Design a protein around this ligand. Sequence first.
Ligand SMILES: O=C(NC[C@H]1CCCO1)C1CCCCC1
Length: 330
Amino acid sequence: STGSATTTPIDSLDDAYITPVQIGTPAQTLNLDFDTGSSDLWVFSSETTASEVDGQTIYTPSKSTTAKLLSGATWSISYGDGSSSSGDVYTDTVSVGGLTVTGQAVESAKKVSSSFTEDSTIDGLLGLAFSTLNTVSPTQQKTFFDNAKASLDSPVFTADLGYHAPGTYNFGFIDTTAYTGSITYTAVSTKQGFWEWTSTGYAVGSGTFKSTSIDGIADTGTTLLYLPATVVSAYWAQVSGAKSSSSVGGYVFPCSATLPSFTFGVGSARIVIPGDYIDFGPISTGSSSCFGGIQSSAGIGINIFGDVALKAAFVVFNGATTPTLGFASK
Ligand SMILES: O=C(NC[C@H]1CCCO1)C1CCCCC1
């Protein structure tokens, strides 16, 4: 089998991407944030505290003839931005772009933190990291991809995120028309539960490529590119007036600037992030200070190749017995 679904920016800055997902019978379509940095499929629901729901579409398990309570199961997750959610668990039929899994764990939120409430466009998350990170207790549950894998034509999914435009998540096949040149595959460590890999270096604009190993994760659920402070300083040093602002919480730059590109290495290959992709706009409405799309990972404990990096590439998440990651230009 295969599946294919379009993923769409939630706003004009590409802060996140949402993909429609069918849950239950009859189908209830929710717009979920596909997140290769976590492993829970959770949704706003009829059980979510009313004051914490503000415009989201909710899953109502009592209206699904295929929903079953997963008795005694609970979940609770907190993300690196300090947001969180928790609740109980149903199994139900879940379909993405034509690909169906029966008995998928659907984690129903009883509580969500303010950031989730405040984002009316995201109805939940669909985790695509390794199932070892799933938070359901006392019986850990599998991701949608892990459940689908064996049935897929090839045990893979691909992320083709757009810049200020829609893109595509495919399951079970590699669309050879979606990228230029070849796909370079690189080794993955699953030891921390992530799609963790080692970039071979970087360049700033037209500058000399620096060979240096950068361990990090491919994370579709993180907006920005988080890299070591040395690398990030080298980038922003090329932008007149750019500086790290403790009050704002990262590098800012004059909105009048034209940003240089940023290149990262994948083996002997190179992915080029255009400068425009690194502009996240005014720090507050009407400001002439703009927020940078490349930020230090110093506070995070891991480097993160988030959407800023991934949307410059066609990315293969290869879930073969020995997982790997592939990157192609596009
Ligand atoms: O919290 C993180 N990113 C943002 C969250 C917000 C909701 C989806 O992702 C990352 C932090 C590094 C480890 C993997 C998760």
